[PDB]
Design a protein around this nucleic acid. Sequence first.
RNA 1: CCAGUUCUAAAGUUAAGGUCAUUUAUUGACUGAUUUUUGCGAAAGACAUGGUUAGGGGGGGAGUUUGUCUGGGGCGGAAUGC
Length: 33
Amino acid sequence: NPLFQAKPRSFRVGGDIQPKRDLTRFVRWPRYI
RNA sequence: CCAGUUCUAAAGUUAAGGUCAUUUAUUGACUGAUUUUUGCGAAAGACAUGGUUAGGGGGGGAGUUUGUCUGGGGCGGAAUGC
Ligand SMILES: [Mg+2]
Ligand SMILES: [Mg+2]
Ligand SMILES: [Mg+2]
């Protein structure tokens, strides 16, 4: 509407570039933990 | 259930936008990009694998042996024991 108009992004496969998400479970951790 | 990327040797990153505050600045906070989960993912699973024993197999490889007499030695024969 104003010069500020919305610009969508599609994260379904084969689409725009995936964003940063919480990978905590999938992290590589040193032996000890 | 299907699709939100199939004519096209391109472009696709420090983002938009919404909601709420401050502050009037790409400032702050949520959302934009759902949730839960004391297995990154998959394949086998007490099987395989490893350990020690037991029976096979093994000139690939090690070691060694392969009598004596003897008209040279060998082939033959024993005048090798009686
Ligand atoms: Mg054996
Ligand atoms: Mg030999
Ligand atoms: Mg005789």
